[PDB]
Amino acid sequence: MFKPLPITLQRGALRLEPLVEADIPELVSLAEANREALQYMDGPTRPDWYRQSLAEQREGRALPLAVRLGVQLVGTTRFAEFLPALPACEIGWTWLDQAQHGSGLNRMIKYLMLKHAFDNLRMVRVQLSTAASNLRAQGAIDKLGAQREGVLRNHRRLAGGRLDDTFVYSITDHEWPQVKAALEASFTG
Amino acid sequence: PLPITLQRGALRLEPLVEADIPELVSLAEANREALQYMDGPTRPDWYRQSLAEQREGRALPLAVRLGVQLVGTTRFAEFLPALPACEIGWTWLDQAQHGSGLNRMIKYLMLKHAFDNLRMVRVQLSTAASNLRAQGAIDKLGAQREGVLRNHRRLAGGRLDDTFVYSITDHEWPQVKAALEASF
């Protein structure tokens, strides 16, 4: 019996709050201005993508989050692919407005969600995955301390519809205390 | 995903229906011993769960018949419609078919349907890291190990275990098909 509940996470001006329908126009618009950075995820420029993340939430298959800095929307991320009997999930489907590319915002987001996943939901496993072609995301997930677990062939389509492989990484609950220590050792006080 | 009938001589795979569940549960209870894991074949809700996913477009569970006789079940699940891709698994057969090769011909029929009818680019298979038997059967299919997912499943007694994930791409399918055919 695992049922995910809505969560807001904060640190300073950074707030992760449950995605609602009233956010979709602004997020779609911001994603479109970030079209070229989104070449490795197919969906964030279409309104349907956010409606389907809300549908999955309605069946308790996801907790999609809007990312705000102060008042302004800045992007999205989600917990998803719940394995309720473990419990396990996946974190990803993240994008940020290019004004935040390289400020440690992405790493702070993964930290907040990882901590919530392991410390509060007692996940035994958090999966992270990305396109085989998305080298930047592979390096950021490695620096998280996740371990690559495999490469799934012909497993996703990029923005043009080209077939790509998927790199799959995970953190287990027993290694999380070490991962957590190293992540918080990396944050500016 | 849509209902469908796959056949090969006496072997027939057809969509699972609620009316088959009593006989399948009963037949698995006669094979209780031979089912360490999985958890499922003795539980009617395990079958109804798969029927429910089918109404949501997420699984295609099949009754396995030899002639008119129900001998087991198997399914397609984990659909990725944009690729398209899926997983085949959740197979069990009563012990009269143990070591008879029916398992591999079932996989042959299912893999044919996924690649040659549905034109999938990826068929996934997986098993517990502790299930050495199922690993050897998957190897002999020619499926290539792709990943080891840690803490990815609970075994029948509840303990955490890793999952070995394998796949067959569409380009490997010709050779997989020929090697399956040669072994019949």
Residue numbers in the entry:
A (entry chain A): 7 to 195
B (entry chain C): 10 to 193
Sentences from the paper on this structure:
GCN5-related N-acetyltransferase (GNAT) toxin, with an acetyltransferase activity-dependent mechanism of translation inhibition, represents a relatively new and expanding family of type II TA toxins. We here describe a group of GNAT-Xre TA modules widely distributed among Pseudomonas species. Notably, other than arresting translation through acetylating aminoacyl-tRNAs, PacT can directly bind to Fur, a key ferric uptake regulator, to attenuate its DNA-binding affinity and thus permit the expression of downstream iron-acquisition-related genes. Previously studies on GNAT-RHH TA family also observed pronounced growth arrest after expression of the GNAT-type toxin and co-expression of its upstream antitoxin gene counteracted the toxic effect. It has been also demonstrated that the translational repression function of GNAT-type toxin depend on its acetyltransferase activity which transfers the acetyl group from acetyl coenzyme A (AcCoA) to the amine group of aa-tRNAs, subsequently resulting in the inhibition of translation.
